[PDB]
UniProtKB/TrEMBL annotation:
Residues found modified as Cysteine sulfinic acid (-SO2H): 169
Metallo-beta-lactamase domain sequence ranges: 39-211
NCBIfam families in the record: bla_class_B_core, bla_subclass_B1, blaVIM
Residue sites binding Zn(2+) 2 per the record: 89, 169
Family in the record: Belongs to the metallo-beta-lactamase superfamily. Class-B beta-lactamase family.
Keywords: Antibiotic resistance, Hydrolase, Metal-binding, Periplasm, Plasmid, Signal, Zinc
GO molecular function annotations of the record: beta-lactamase activity; metal ion binding
Gene (name only): blaVIM
Protein name: beta-lactamase
Length: 232
């Protein structure tokens, strides 16, 4: 009823949308992995009379439910999707998107990692993002490669019209007490990558983590803090 949705409100298989700003929504879904249930976020950005999707809803059936929820709540076609790294909470559902006529994109680094791991593979390669600090435009967003953090390929997304920073899994929510699933992370580089985000996007007004509650710029420093304490 207006608060940011959580698992307790999200059975696995259902998707909720949350209005972040004019023409910007997050999507929230839940999934089981290794016997525990997790929420995860993605982004939807209005692109004229079409929509740009950032990240799947973590699974094929969740992603089908996402498309149905978008039709119900927004009613504009999703034409393109970008996956911000290679894990199943970002690419699981790309086959559903592709069969629904959505053009799917990711960096070559994400595509290679997805392929090697056996995850779903976005169709199109996003060049221009291979060095830390790189940025490119993609419809109504800027894509930014901050360097290795949660994964070596993680991208962040900025919505300039609304000063919305979508950190993806490189950014954690304020209530977090650990740095999430760090199996593919670079804990030593992560703070430097966060510092690059902070320098590049100092006017961000909303910061959205890959999992959990949006907040403000404090999510960035908090993420560095939890990662440094994990490493140590
Ligand atoms: C789909 C992804 O696959 C990872 C692979 C690694 C090893 N090879 C197989 C798959 C995955 C699976 C399960 C959990 C997570 C999480 C995760 C875990 C805990 C918390 C709560 S917290 C901040 O307080 O620790 C949280 F927010 C997020 C994250 C993430 O951190 O991005 N990613 C996850
Ligand atoms: Zn991940
Ligand atoms: Zn994640």
């Amino acid at each position: 009823s207006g608060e940011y949705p959580t698992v307790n409100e999200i059975p696995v298989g259902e998707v909720r949308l949350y209005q972040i700003a004019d023409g910007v929504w997050s999507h929230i879904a839940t999934q089981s992995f290794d016997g525990a249930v997790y929420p995860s976020n993605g982004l939807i950005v209005r692109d004229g009379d079409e929509l740009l999707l950032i990240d799947t809803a973590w699974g094929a059936k969740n992603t089908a439910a996402l498309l149905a929820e978008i039709e119900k709540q927004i009613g504009l076609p999703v034409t393109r999707a970008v996956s911000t790294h290679f894990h199943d909470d970002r690419v699981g559902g790309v086959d559903v998107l592709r069969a629904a006529g959505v053009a799917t994109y990711a960096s070559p680094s994400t595509r290679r990692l997805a392929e090697a791991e056996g995850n779903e593979i976005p169709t199109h390669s996003l060049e221009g993002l291979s060095s830390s600090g790189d940025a490119v435009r993609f419809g109504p967003v800027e894509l930014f490669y901050p360097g290795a953090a949660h994964s070596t390929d993680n991208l962040v997304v900025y919505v300039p019209s609304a000063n919305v920073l979508y950190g993806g899994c490189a950014v954690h929510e304020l209530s977090s007490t650990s740095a999430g699933n760090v199996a593919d992370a670079d804990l030593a580089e992560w703070p430097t990558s966060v510092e690059r985000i902070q320098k590049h996007y100092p006017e961000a007004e909303v910061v959205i983590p890959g999992h959990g509650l949006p907040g403000g710029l404090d999510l960035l420093q908090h993420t560095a803090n939890v990662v440094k304490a994990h490493k140590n």
